[PDB]
Design a protein around this ligand. Structure first.
Ligand code: SF4
Ligand code: ZN
Ligand code: ZN
Ligand code: ZN
Ligand code: ZN
Lengths: 374, 752
């Protein structure tokens, strides 16, 4: 019955004792394979999202620095800034779950600043109580009722608890959501929840990829970011129509004038082309004729979602190459036996690794393709 | 899919197939072709029932023999599950083959589960249901009605309506589950109980429980209808020894003997009343008895004996009645003095263990009852009761136990033992003597099955070790093997906790059940796991008494209050209906996301067939090894018998008996390879029992998890649950854990 002391000494120093360039590429080659599958899927550019955040006792855990509540709210502020930047003509609503009740903190509106203020205020209150998905879903269902049929009704839920207390039958609410064509995305924190999986599956035409559980703080930012892009529409769900909106013309007046939206004096504003009323900022629904007012820039922000740039396929080192320098940035390609050239099939022009990421992430037009004359 | 074996085309009802199922199916076919018995153990996470039905049903439909299939389960709930799986296959086969082939599949259960009579189906016990149904279907009412229409005796419309149609037209071709069978019979006013029983001989596959195959009381009638060359499947047979033992066991109490005397006096009074007015019936029965006819000859096929045969059919004497009990009055006197002898033997002051031979000798001394008349006691009583017009048999019910005791004790002498204890319950103010007739050898009840049938398949999810079962039950197997599931990513996390967060050893030993340190450690473990378990958490206790005591202590200590915050508490109860209601509520809470925790007994009704797949079962908390009660006369005698005969050590069998129940509960949480859960065995004694677990469970149990703590186990559970929630990469499992049709063909080509 001897103890571990008498056996031997650990001898930690014994543990430690004293192609690579190809490895760095094959990983790049494999990663390009994942993104090679890109098709012009139809997407609903006009969105109506109801952001539901969990603020309960389970959100007081110390898993995420400093705590789940602070980080989720902190990421929520980031989400609003990114969402409206890439979805200018969409609207957002914010709900929170506290004391087994759903609390409205932001009405559906197209003004990003209003949502930011509400989120910042929520950052102070200490979360407590039990969550209630049914209360949140019912409130989200009501908030999305006064929305046009051409918009995409979506609900993003950040769930942190493993249990839910509801006053009624959750399955009935799930059935109502499907009838109302609302789409629900759930970002869990700890583990899968049976009701959440059913909600995400039955509500998304059986797809099970809309219920995501993070594995670290780095992944959580990726999960939040992925929700900014518009969600592809289902084939059998047809709501095609024409929406009447106008393009106002900016003015520059010498004296201040009252705004028809806030009844506040503002120097400059955009004049509606249907009733001549002035609005401080865009894009917003005109306060008089209920006609959406937007600029041409807002529409152009969503063209890349309808005509995605086809992926760039690697070029094997067996074949010869056209030029020693990048077409767009003329960055000399290191010789390294492997190649770093990325070619666009449409124009067959070599691109460096740096541009390829930039062209497909910041820009949305291939420099070579535009230069090429038909 | 539709793949090919050496010469047998089999239609699988799914587009994909696991590697284990194909290997399992291949082995079963070889056993059937070569003939003999086999013991196949397959993980619970892989479809077993579908694989068995697919191959076996394909086997009969192709080969010229067209051998029938006999499926044996342990509970009625499993019968419905198999039938639903059975319906799935035939529906797929019908769609693929373009026609509904001639196939009949029915389940067999008691009247209580198949009685549609508005007044007879509202009983709380099956014995009363059988008596009432027999009264309306024995034929006495029909004969009396024919002679005199004015007779007030009633009939059963469901039973009567069957006579109009032929047996072959009772049900349409196909498979009829219990849910479907009741609906079809209700719409046409027919009796499902009589439909199935008269239709067993015409069923390609017949499904019933082990009691209908091992218990001689109900096995003889069903066994006579099934074929002799049929395929026999034993599903979930890891506790078949218990079923065999209880088939030939009996318990007698002072109340039973007291009630028996009342019945005996009533029979004597009834005989006198019949003698005065109608003596011809007695003479007619006596004349037939003198000739040498037995219950089979006199009784019509429509009626059944009052006392079910308690011994195997092969052990029944074929000679005439000895003569001492030939007449009604003489038999009553013979029956009465037998009861008196039993009563005086219950006045002992110490436990007495005696063999049947010694009991008979003492009986032959104090009184003058020989062995041979006792063997005919049950047979003679049924004839007497039949001829006495006993329409109400409430008083004579107690005499059935006495008749059973006489036949059992006078028939078997080896492998049986009689225990007389002055204290049925040691914690009682007044002694309550009890007499127990016990069967020690479990192979006696199963011996006829292994000889009558050529091929038998023994399959289960946690049948290990496979060598013990041939040792315990006297049979030999052509092949016995256990499969290891080829899962790409681990789906079940088996762990063993030997101490609490305080590092104090934890055990469920009965003598320290009321221990503040042990109770608190288990309660903290229960609370901590409920914090992280998403949907469902099942907890199994070694015994109901331990659960009752420990739960009460938790309530006083306030531990239950913390659990109530995160999950609803459902507790198994002695009442079967209440426990069933708890299961429905437990499942409802898991489905709706409220979260629930179920407290049950490892050797209870929940563990013997109820499965917690997917959300219902995510964490299994085994509180201690489910050891039996060591200080039990029944168990000690059985242990000695096995040690002397089969050379099985008492400790080894006790460990084997407890581990099989623990593993049984562990395997009720995985259905497919996408199901996941955490299995924690909370006892210091599980640490050295890793080799005793099923192979597929031992493989998943890592060395670092042999002895963990509550805090350490919780950390692993949190990490494991988080990992299992991530989207699985399809390429990691395309052809290593799940096979398509092309992948299966590759396997066949490579092997060949
Ligand atoms: S014949 Fe059938 S329905 Fe009628 S009492 Fe008997 S079991 Fe019940
Ligand atoms: Zn304004
Ligand atoms: Zn306007
Ligand atoms: Zn470049
Ligand atoms: Zn290009």
């Amino acid at each position: 019955g001897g103890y571990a002391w008498e056996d031997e000494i650990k001898r930690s120093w014994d543990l430690v004792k004293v192609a690579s360039l190809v490895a760095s590429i094959v990983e790049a080659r494999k990663k390009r394979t994942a993104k090679k599958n890109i098709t012009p899927y139809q997407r609903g550019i006009i969105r109506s999202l109801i952001l539901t955040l969990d603020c309960s006792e389970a959100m007081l855990e110390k898993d995420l620095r400093p705590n789940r509540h602070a980080m989720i709210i902190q990421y929520a502020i980031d989400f609003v800034h990114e969402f409206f930047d890439q979805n200018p003509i969409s609207q957002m609503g914010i709900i929170i779950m506290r004391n087994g009740l759903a609390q409205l903190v932001s009405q559906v509106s197209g003004n990003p600043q209003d949502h930011i203020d509400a989120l910042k205020s929520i950052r102070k209150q200490e979360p407590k109580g039990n969550p209630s998905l049914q209360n949140a879903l019912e409130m989200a269902r009501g908030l999305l009722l006064p929305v046009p049929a051409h918009c995409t009704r979506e609900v993003l839920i950040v769930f942190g608890s493993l249990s839910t207390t509801d006053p009624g039958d959750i399955h009935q609410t799930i059935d109502s959501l499907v009838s109302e064509k609302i789409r629900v995305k759930v970002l869990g924190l700890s583990a899968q929840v049976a009701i959440c999986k059913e909600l995400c599956k039955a509500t998304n035409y059986g797809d099970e990829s809309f219920y995501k559980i993070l594995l670290d703080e780095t992944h959580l930012k990726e999960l939040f970011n992925e929700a900014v892009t518009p969600l592809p529409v289902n084939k059998i769900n047809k709501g095609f129509t024409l929406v009447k909106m106008g393009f106002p013309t900016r003015i520059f007046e010498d004296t201040p004038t009252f705004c028809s939206c806030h009844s506040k004096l503002v120097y400059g504003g955009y004049f509606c082309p249907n009733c001549h009323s002035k609005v401080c900022s865009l894009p917003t629904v005109c306060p008089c004729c209920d006609l959406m007012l937007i600029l041409s820039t807002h529409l152009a922000r969503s063209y890349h979602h309808l005509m995605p740039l086809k992926t760039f396929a690697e070029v094997p080192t067996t074949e010869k190459f056209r030029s020693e320098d990048c077409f767009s940035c003329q960055s000399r390609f290191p010789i390294l036996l492997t190649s770093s050239r990325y070619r666009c099939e449409d124009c067959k022009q070599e691109f460096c690794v740096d541009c390829d990421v930039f062209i497909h992430e910041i820009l949305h037009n291939c420099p070579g393709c535009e230069s090429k004359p038909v | 899919m539709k793949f090919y074996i050496d010469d047998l085309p089999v239609l699988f009802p799914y587009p994909k197939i696991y590697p284990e199922q194909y290997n399992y199916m291949c082995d079963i076919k070889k056993t059937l072709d070569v003939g003999g018995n086999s013991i196949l153990e397959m993980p619970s996470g892989t479809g077993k029932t579908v694989s068995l039905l697919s191959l076996t049903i394909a086997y009969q439909m192709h080969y010229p023999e067209h051998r029938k299939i006999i499926y044996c389960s342990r509970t009625m709930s499993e019968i419905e599950k198999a039938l639903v799986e059975l319906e799935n296959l035939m529906d797929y086969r019908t769609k693929e083959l373009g026609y509904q082939e001639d196939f009949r599949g029915l389940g067999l259960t008691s009247r209580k589960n198949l009685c549609l009579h508005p007044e007879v189906s509202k009983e709380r016990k099956g014995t009363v249901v059988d008596e009432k149904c027999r009264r309306m279907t024995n034929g006495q009412a029909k004969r009396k009605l024919e002679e005199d229409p004015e007779a007030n005796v009633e009939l059963c419309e469901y039973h009567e309506n069957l006579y109009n149609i032929e047996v072959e037209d009772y049900l349409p071709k196909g498979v009829f589950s219990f849910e479907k069978l009741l609906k079809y019979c209700e719409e046409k006013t027919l009796c499902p109980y009589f439909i199935v029983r008269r239709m067993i001989s015409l069923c390609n596959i017949i499904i019933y429980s082990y009691h209908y195959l091992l218990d001689p009381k109900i096995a003889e009638r069903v066994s006579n209808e099934v074929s002799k060359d049929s395929i026999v499947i034993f599903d979930e047979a890891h506790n078949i020894d218990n079923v065999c033992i209880e088939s030939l066991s009996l318990d007698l109490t002072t109340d039973a003997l007291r009630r028996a005397t009342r019945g005996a006096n009533a029979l004597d009074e009834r005989i006198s009343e019949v003698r005065k007015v109608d003596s011809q019936k007695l003479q007619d029965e006596y004349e037939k008895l003198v000739q040498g006819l037995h219950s089979a000859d006199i009784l019509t096929d429509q009626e059944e004996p009052f006392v079910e045969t308690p011994v195997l059919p092969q052990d029944l004497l074929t000679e005439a009645i000895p003569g001492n009990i030939r007449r009604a009055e003489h038999f009553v006197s013979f029956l009465k003095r037998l009861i008196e002898y039993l009563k005086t033997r219950m006045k002992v002051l110490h436990v007495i263990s005696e063999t049947p031979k010694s009991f008979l000798q003492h009986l032959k001394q104090l009184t003058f009852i020989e062995r041979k008349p006792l063997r005919f006691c049950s047979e003679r009583l049924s004839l007497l009761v039949r001829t006495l017009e006993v329409t109400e048999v409430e008083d004579f019910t107690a005499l059935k136990d006495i008749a059973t005791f006489a036949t059992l004790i006078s028939t078997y002498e080896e492998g049986f033992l009689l225990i007389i204890e002055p204290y049925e319950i040691e914690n009682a103010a007044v002694p309550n003597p009890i007499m127990r007739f016990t069967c020690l050898d479990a192979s006696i009840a199963i011996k006829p099955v292994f000889e009558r049938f050529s091929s038998v398949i023994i399959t289960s999810g946690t049948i290990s070790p496979l060598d013990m079962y041939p040792r315990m039950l006297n049979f030999k197997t052509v092949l016995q093997k256990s499969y290891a599931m080829t899962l790409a990513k681990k789906s079940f996390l088996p762990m063993i906790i030997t101490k609490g967060s305080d590092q104090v050893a934890i055990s469920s030993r009965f003598e320290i059940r009321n221990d503040p340190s042990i109770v608190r450690n288990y309660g903290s473990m229960l609370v901590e796991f409920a914090k992280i378990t998403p949907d469902g958490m099942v907890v199994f206790f070694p015994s109901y008494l331990y659960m009752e005591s420990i739960v009460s202590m938790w309530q006083t200590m306030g531990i239950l209050d913390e659990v109530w915050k995160h999950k609803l508490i459902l507790v198994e109860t002695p009442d079967a209906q209440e426990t069933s209601l708890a299961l429905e509520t437990y499942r409802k809470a898991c489905s709706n996301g409220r979260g629930a925790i179920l407290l049950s007994v490892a050797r209870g009704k929940v563990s013997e067939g109820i499965d917690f797949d997917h959300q219902y079962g995510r964490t299994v908390l085994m509180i201690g090894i489910p050891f039996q009660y060591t200080e039990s006369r029944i168990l000690k005698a059985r242990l000695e018998f096995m040690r002397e005969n089969y050379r099985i050590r008492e400790n080894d069998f006790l460990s084997f008996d407890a581990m099989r129940h623990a593993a049984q509960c562990l395997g009720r949480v995985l259905r497919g390879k996408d199901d996941y859960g955490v299995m924690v065995l909370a006892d210091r004694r599980f640490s050295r029992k890793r080799s005793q677990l099923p192979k597929w469970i031992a493989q998943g149990l890592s060395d670092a998890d042999l002895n963990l703590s509550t805090d350490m186990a919780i950390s692993n559970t949190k990490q494991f649950l988080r990992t299992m929630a991530q989207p699985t990469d399809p390429k990691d499992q395309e052809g290593v854990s799940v096979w398509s049709y092309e992948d299966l063909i590759k396997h066949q080509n490579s092997r060949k």
